[PDB]
Amino acid sequence: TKVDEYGAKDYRLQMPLKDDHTSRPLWVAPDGHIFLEAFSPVYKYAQDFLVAIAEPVCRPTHVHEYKLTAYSLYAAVSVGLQTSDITEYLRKLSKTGVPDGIMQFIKLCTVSYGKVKLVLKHNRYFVESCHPDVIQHLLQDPVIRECRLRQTVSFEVKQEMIEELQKRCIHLEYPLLAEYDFRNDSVNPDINIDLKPTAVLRPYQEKSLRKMFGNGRARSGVIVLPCGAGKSLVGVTAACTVRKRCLVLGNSAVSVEQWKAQFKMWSTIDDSQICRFTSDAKDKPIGCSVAISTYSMLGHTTKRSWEAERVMEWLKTQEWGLMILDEVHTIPAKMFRRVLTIVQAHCKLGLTATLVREDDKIVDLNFLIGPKLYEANWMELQNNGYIAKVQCAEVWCPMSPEFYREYVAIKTKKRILLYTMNPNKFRACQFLIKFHERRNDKIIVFADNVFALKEYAIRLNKPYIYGPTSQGERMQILQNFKHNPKINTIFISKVGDTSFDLPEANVLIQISSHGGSRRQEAQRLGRVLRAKKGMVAEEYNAFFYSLVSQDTQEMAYSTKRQRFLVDQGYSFKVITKLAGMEEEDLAFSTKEEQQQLLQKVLAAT
Amino acid sequence: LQCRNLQEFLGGLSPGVLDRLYGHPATCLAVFRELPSLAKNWVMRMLFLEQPLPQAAVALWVKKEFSKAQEESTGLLSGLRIWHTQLLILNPIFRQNLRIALLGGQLGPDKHARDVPSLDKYAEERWEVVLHFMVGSPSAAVSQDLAQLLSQAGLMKSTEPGEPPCITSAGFQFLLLDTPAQLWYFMLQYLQTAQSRGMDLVEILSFLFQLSFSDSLLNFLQHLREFGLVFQRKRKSRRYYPTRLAINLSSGVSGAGGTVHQPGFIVVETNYRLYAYTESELQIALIALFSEMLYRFPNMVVAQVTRESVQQAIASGITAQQIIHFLRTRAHPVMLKQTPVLPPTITDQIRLWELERDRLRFTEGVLYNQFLSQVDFELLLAHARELGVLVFENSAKRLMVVTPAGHSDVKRFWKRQKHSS
């Protein structure tokens, strides 16, 4: 609305500056953005309060940035905070008061809660509201009557239409409450599972659980925790908390195996009580209460096998007290989201290390699952030592002239290969590998295109890993890498970042990436976040290097791809050249070698 | 024309002006205190000597170490013609005025005795409005003499007759300089433009020295009041009070410390975001020169340092050095704790963006090709090298290029060489 002679939005006509603004560490913008002095004496209280009421945008070292959202406001009401309570404390923290536009915005979002609640009973879904009249106006659109099946008033809703109705309810300004009173529920039988005292719960984990379990009723939503932060333990703890039949869904069979191990590792539950409903393996799922499977299995669009149909019908008919969803960034997919309509679950908890995707469907998680129940501050976890200090870097590999000549000439998809394969990027990786290998550092090499992966790994005489590599060959390489001292690096394709349980490594070199996507970048970095046998956070023991070809599309993709990491606070140090690479003996030391590779690169046709 | 120190101006002085400039009231004190730590001793020693001494004595009075500094200081004082070898006898006017300066050799009704804080605040205020006029402010203080001064100072240029003056490449660089350095360049340009416009530099410059401790002086003094460097309650008062800025004068950041003795306010985040705890729009205008401003609060502004805003600044003429300096000199107390104060990623990115802007170095030149022999080619090359006219050479490829001006000399030589036939 108001803009100065400069592009900055100004709010002098919108809010005043309080008398003790120097003591107050926060500002409230009329557009919903919020800033917080991380160095302020009350930062601790303000951080908790802003994580409770707002959505974090950036959390750098000196000033954090947040924005208000209906979902974040609903979460605030979900922990019992009244409009006056958040307003009074926000005004007290705000050094420039609260703009009336935000105050009235908060009013609407606060009063629009508690009015309508969705609950399921006897495999039937009922929409309840305390006020009886609200239903009459809320039903004024036939989409609800067609969705509706043919005090505390309620009506039953057609299961298949719940997704459409729930999304409408948001833009209809009447969100559905999803608190599940697992404590006062005798209809769904409890399960004999508890967290064994061997399990250790960290403060951030405890915070996320406390925020999810704001009362005796579990709240649905998404918890964002790094893979190294023990997201699996939180999920297992939530199941142990709900004490009712629960369904865990992983994005891969490897994850399903990981979950089984974690459940046995952290809970009193026995192996027979856990089943891994999977096409590749059978555990007689109907024989036990805890089930584990994948979106590909349940979400399967084609004809089901007769045996798998037996379990699925049993799964369909049973009601799940808790539905744990891992790597929910995939959930908004057209097929994966169908799982939410197929399975009947009282409360659904989503977990993921990278709640980002290149499509505008991430926001669906707010209605498909719920608001962000928690989102760890990765810098705080490093400061607390829970995550390894990773000195990220971007090596600006200069492209070779004969490569650039072709790269600039070829505008088709073939340039992705040419910018991925050049002597300088190759020599740089070989040099960094040799250096870290002679430094006795475990190194993981990452790539996308198999052609470059092969030609690099073969020229480096190192074992690569990719899709068609059988599980036996694949794991045998990991065991050698982990244990054999003579091997210290592995060349992994997307298989390593998509979904896997790779052994932790001190160093990671990414020579190729699918694009400027944030998701894959943070998934790759996640592999090195694991704490080592004797490291310390100030040691800067972990490393992460992105190899990019200067003056190429890789530069655009790389900067675009790092957005999520810089938002979390990571410093991508640019490396123009590495001292010693001029004298170290490396491949492509003569133009004929470059020409030979370039010729074969062109032969790719 | 980045005249970063007095020494450049000192060299720009002839004996016919030095002798007059070497007045007893202030020049001797100002010059002497500005001489190197070594030469000050010898000048004071020979203040009582009427007979010259050989350079060997000065040389042997200094160790082999520091002899270069003695030679350099000797070069300055000999360049200043303070003495003559006559074989280092001081100039009589210099010796006499230095002698009188040690002891010296005027009063009236009391003044308003305004408080020193008030004087320095309006002085800073006066300099600020000068900068507000210098920047693209929609409204600012103006004056025909101030405008033409900044224009003749090469800081501003008028694009169209009647349109407000705009900033030059030097002007943008100048705007980011620290107040003392920024004021220095202005003082230097005023002095140069003063002699150019007929104001006797001797009198006004000697007056500047006096302030650091005739109608021409009155006119000049009026400008100093308009610059806020001196206080005069009313144009009728024959007495004025020099402000802190005028007292500092040519002392530079080495005297009484740099302008860094001020509250820092810029915060720089690793995401290129800026937070400057400021209300003074001048700082905002400067920040806007190289960063995209996002939000403005009563006491702080939020901005981001992007490729667009920085490369635009670089294209306008700014340098990453000035930007990094402007930030570092304004860095907020909170970020002073980290070392370096600025985040390395930010500093490296800014430098890398400017270095990208000049990836291609363009140089005018004339290229000769098809040299019939390597001998005459190398002979002509040796002449081009001897003339310093060579721009680039590749003897293996038998080629060289030379500056267009220098080309006329090789063109003449080539014709001369060819006309030997």
């Binding site: 250096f435 040691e539 800067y540 123009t576 590495l578 | 390395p344 500093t347 430098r351 270095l355």
Partner: peptide
Amino acid sequence: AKERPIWLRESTVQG
């Protein structure tokens, strides 16, 4: 032991 390399110790940009 295990000290940071030079390329991570200092600015590699020419400035």
